[PDB]
Ligand binder design. Structure first.
Ligand SMILES: Cc1ncc(COP(=O)(O)O)c(CN[C@@H](CCC(=O)O)C(=O)O)c1O
Ligand SMILES: Cc1ncc(COP(=O)(O)O)c(CN[C@@H](CCC(=O)O)C(=O)O)c1O
Lengths: 397, 397
């Protein structure tokens, strides 16, 4: 017989398919005894388990025939309505998705072809890179700094290339924590409007602001200006339950129709029980829930910064968050994050090495830390161990 | 300002993105008053809504932290073990997917490139066609007949073409209802083994057999032979709940790894609550449940044939199912199924015109009828109305 060799049987796509270190690391971090600063896993004590149990049961008893049946792709109507009210659009402009990860998959399918340019920050969210990579695009990057993307570098890229879209996370970027301030958002919008460019705005961390208010999204600025080119991505993952896999894409009807049709082939539709459950949980008390979310992450972030300031040598650089889940660390004198990873893990501490957040490589001396999962005690202890680990490595470079 | 034009903004991919008529028809059929022979939607009386409610609440109360949190991509351990035991493999060989529709999308990503040959029947499941078409493949088809795929036709294709895989639904195919007999399964396996080819075997309707026993799957026959090239797809959709979106792929470790990594970029993971709920519902009493689902559909099938034999002119031909959800109809004298659909719709009867089930086109005179949803009375009355529409159109052309 002719042998079957898998490497041979695979299409060219398969070579662009690689594991996510974030996804893989969860197998390690969910194990008892690990102090995790790895994945952006929401604080478990914010899970409304009792309320979820009541809501799920009522949905299934009274609306079982709907929760358990096939449903149209666009989403459970009341959820589309609720998202529409919150974001300030019409329901028919909302698509419910299977996590914002799916929306990333969908936008890559709709806009990217082999060799097509796509613009994102270096570093940016590895899951977006992973999703877009499948299409075989050319990644164009600009540095991400404490004030979001380098707009001068962006202006230079735009003189040379026409990206299929710009993928951005203006509000507490994954992984740097950067917040793009209002003037830069307006400058960005101007650059995109002048060139009629598409922006995919990933707003996973929208509500996790630590300060008095949130900044207007690029989507809200675009809507004010009457510009139709911002595709807006939001998620219930960081505010309620990541495991429910319920999120949304809001877009111009032409773009949304393509995202809908791509979704039909991706999974038919997002599980109906899950969408119903989100809507039942959020339809009353959402602002109050969001206030608590903000406080819980603000306190964790404060504990995180207090411990880093005390335990980490001053030669090591790290960002200070104004929101979201992450601190971004840069190691000096050529230290490897993978080296540090090894040491820390021996001390039961996990983080994410920064390398794979760089779509074109580099960043071997960087790492992302999440303060979302651990309580204050665990944050302090975990950072003490990391600090110990760094000093040992710094001693021996 | 350079104008933004969506048709211009889209990649080549977007041109390959089209609506599924199955998915679109749900918008119509789920409205009150319609007698739907359209999508393969299970009978609502089979939804264990009361039991699902108890199970959901207990999962959320007792294991809420797990149900609501991010989880690794492969799936909930006890569900994978459940599947492993049922199918007869190791849990490490099982990937939990967000419905088998997701598995189809993943298989296209791993195996297909622009211009890559892929083999399926004409007609076949339109969702598979939709998922695969994204990659820009060259579709090769063989007729789907009463014994399943035309193997003489396949034998001819294989002398000239090397498909990336053969997509098959041997057990009550969508849309013809055909059952590939054991000798034919054995022949196909020899054909595949000699050439070292991959088969994607879609077993959505596996358990829905009307006769005394089910036939061995291509997967089972390959496993007996020690052949590693069958990727096996199964789902809880046709036996428990389509709305939960919980299914599985089983494959050789190398193929499975690629499916896992592709799924990471597609949605991270299938929601944990849904996986847990499926396992809790089926861990006891699965055999008995399946006995009842076979009964329900067998009855519906009998009603459907009884009504068609009564109401439909003998110049119209249709399949007689031995399992599954569908009857496949072929109109004479080049009568259009789309014309029939318009007439039938005016009388509140819906079905799926057969055209989109043909990956390279044709089949305009065909249609798929599902007896899954309606009860005996609805089936009889719906077919009465279809017969009247059919008889009307038969007179004009
Ligand atoms: C900016 C951004 N967008 C999208 C996603 C996907 O989230 P959805 O739940 O699908 O809406 C993440 C995931 N953030 C986590 C993922 C953790 C995991 O995959 O285990 C992270 O980056 O650690 C993200 O940071
Ligand atoms: C052979 C086959 N495979 C896979 C699927 C995907 O189902 P999953 O629930 O994701 O496992 C279907 C859907 N059959 C129905 C779908 C109806 C709808 O999309 O509303 C049908 O073909 O009517 C199918 O017929």
């Amino acid at each position: 017989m002719k042998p079957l060799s898998w490497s041979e049987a695979f299409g060219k796509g398969a070579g662009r398919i690689q594991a996510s270190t974030i996804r893989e690391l969860l197998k390690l971090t969910q194990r008892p005894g690990i102090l995790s600063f790895a994945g952006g896993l929401p604080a478990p004590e914010l899970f409304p388990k009792e309320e979820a149990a009541e809501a799920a049961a009522r949905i299934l008893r009274e609306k079982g025939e709907v929760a358990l049946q096939y449903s149209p792709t666009e989403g459970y109507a009341p959820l589309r309505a609720f998202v529409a009210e919150w974001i300030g659009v019409r329901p028919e402009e909302v698509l419910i998705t299977t996590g914002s990860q799916q929306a990333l998959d969908l936008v890559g399918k709709v806009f990217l072809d082999e060799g097509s340019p796509v613009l994102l920050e270096a570093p940016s969210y590895m899951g977006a890179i992973q999703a877009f990579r499948l299409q075989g695009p050319r990644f164009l990057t600009v540095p991400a700094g404490e004030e979001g993307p380098d707009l001068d570098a962006l202006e230079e890229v735009l003189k040379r290339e026409r990206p299929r879209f710009l993928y951005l996370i203006p509000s507490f970027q994954n992984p740097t924590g950067g917040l793009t301030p209002l003037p830069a958002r307006k400058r960005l919008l101007q650059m995109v409007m002048e060139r009629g460019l598409v922006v995919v705005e990933d707003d996973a961390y929208r509500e996790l602001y630590f300060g008095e208010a949130r900044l207007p999204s690029l989507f809200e600025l675009a809507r004010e200006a009457g510009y139709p080119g911002v595709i807006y991505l939001g998620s219930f993952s960081k505010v309620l339950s990541p495991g429910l896999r319920v999120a949304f894409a809001v877009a111009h009807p032409e773009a949304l129709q393509k995202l809908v049709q791509a979704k039909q082939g991706a999974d038919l539709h997002t599980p109906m029980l899950n969408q119903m459950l989100v809507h039942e949980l959020l339809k009353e008390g959402f602002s109050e829930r969001l206030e608590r979310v903000r406080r819980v992450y603000r306190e964790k972030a404060q504990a995180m910064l207090h411990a880093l300031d005390r335990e980490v040598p001053k030669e090591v650089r790290y960002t200070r968050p104004k929101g979201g889940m992450f601190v971004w660390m840069e190691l000096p004198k050529g230290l490897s994050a993978e080296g540090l990873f090894r040491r820390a893990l021996e001390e039961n501490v996990a983080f994410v090495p920064g390398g794979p957040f760089f779509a074109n490589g580099g960043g071997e001396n960087t790492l992302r830390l999440s303060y979302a999962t651990l309580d204050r005690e665990g944050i302090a202890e975990g950072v003490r161990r990391l600090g110990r680990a760094l000093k040992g490595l710094l001693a021996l470079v």
